[PDB]
Design a protein around this ligand. Structure first.
Ligand SMILES: CC(=O)N[C@@H]1[C@@H](O[C@@H]2O[C@@H](C)[C@@H](O)[C@@H](O)[C@@H]2O)[C@H](O[C@@H]2O[C@H](CO)[C@H](O)[C@H](O[C@]3(C(=O)O)C[C@H](O)[C@@H](NC(C)=O)[C@H]([C@H](O)[C@H](O)CO)O3)[C@H]2O)[C@@H](CO)O[C@@H]1O
Length: 192
């Protein structure tokens, strides 16, 4: 059967979260543009992919939150990330959503567990949902040990849904997509 070393490695990387930040653009040096953020002793460069290229103009953009995962890249930039830019919270959010997980092991044995997942952002990137949920599946359910396929489905109060396919990384352009965190109703996971 197949291994999933690359996915387990990616989704166990540390993540960084920076809130109420000032995002700024410098003169473009390549086709892809990058928002800069300096929350500490480092300058982080966030690639504007998918919807973000048209979303952000010259800037600056204050009152933003960024979800950062440091990626390997062709420029050997040490602090480079993709997507994950959202509007900062107007107030505190502690929104509970049901998380149901079904897992089928290699012997065909099925398990289930239901828990609560806390949404703490008004506006949340698919990047942050995908990354933190997969890390939790690895840590609590051994995702990418024996099994590495299936889906995470984010189900919305308005009937919308967002699907993350577990057998591959989230498509880069989708890391820029953002959704109303307060409108998430429940999350269904199926591992096989
Ligand atoms: C080359 C490439 O990256 N192409 C992508 C599309 O992805 C490919 O085609 C898909 C059909 C699938 O085969 C995938 O493996 C390929 O990489 C991408 O299409 C989305 O793919 C995902 C799964 O990876 C979902 O199926 C998504 O559908 C939904 C969803 O369930 O997430 C449908 C849903 O109705 C919709 N929700 C709302 C409220 O509109 C969401 C939502 O638009 C997205 O999740 C936002 O990111 O999508 C497929 O649409 C496609 C869109 O990202 O972009 C390239 O074309």
């Amino acid at each position: 059967t197949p291994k999933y070393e690359d996915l387990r490695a990616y989704y166990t990387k540390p993540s960084f979260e920076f809130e109420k930040q000032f995002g700024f653009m410098l003169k473009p040096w390549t086709t892809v543009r990058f928002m800069n953020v300096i929350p500490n002793r480092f300058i982080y460069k966030i690639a504007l992919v998918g919807k973000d290229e048209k979303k952000y103009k010259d800037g600056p953009y204050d009152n933003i939150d960024v979800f950062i995962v440091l990626e390997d890249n062709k420029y050997q930039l040490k602090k480079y990330s993709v997507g994950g830019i959202t509007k900062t919270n107007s107030k505190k959010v502690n929104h509970k959503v049901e998380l149901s997980i079904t897992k089928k092991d290699n012997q065909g044995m099925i398990s289930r567990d239901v828990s609560e997942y806390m949404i703490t952002k008004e506006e949340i990137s698919l990047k942050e949902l995908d990354f933190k949920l997969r890390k939790q599946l690895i840590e609590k359910h051994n995702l990418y040990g024996n099994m590495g396929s299936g889906t995470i489905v984010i189900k919305m109060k308005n009937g919308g849904k967002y699907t993350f396919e577990l057998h591959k990384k989230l498509q880069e352009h989708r890391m820029a997509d953002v959704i109303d965190g307060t409108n998430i109703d429940n999350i269904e996971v199926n591992i096989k």
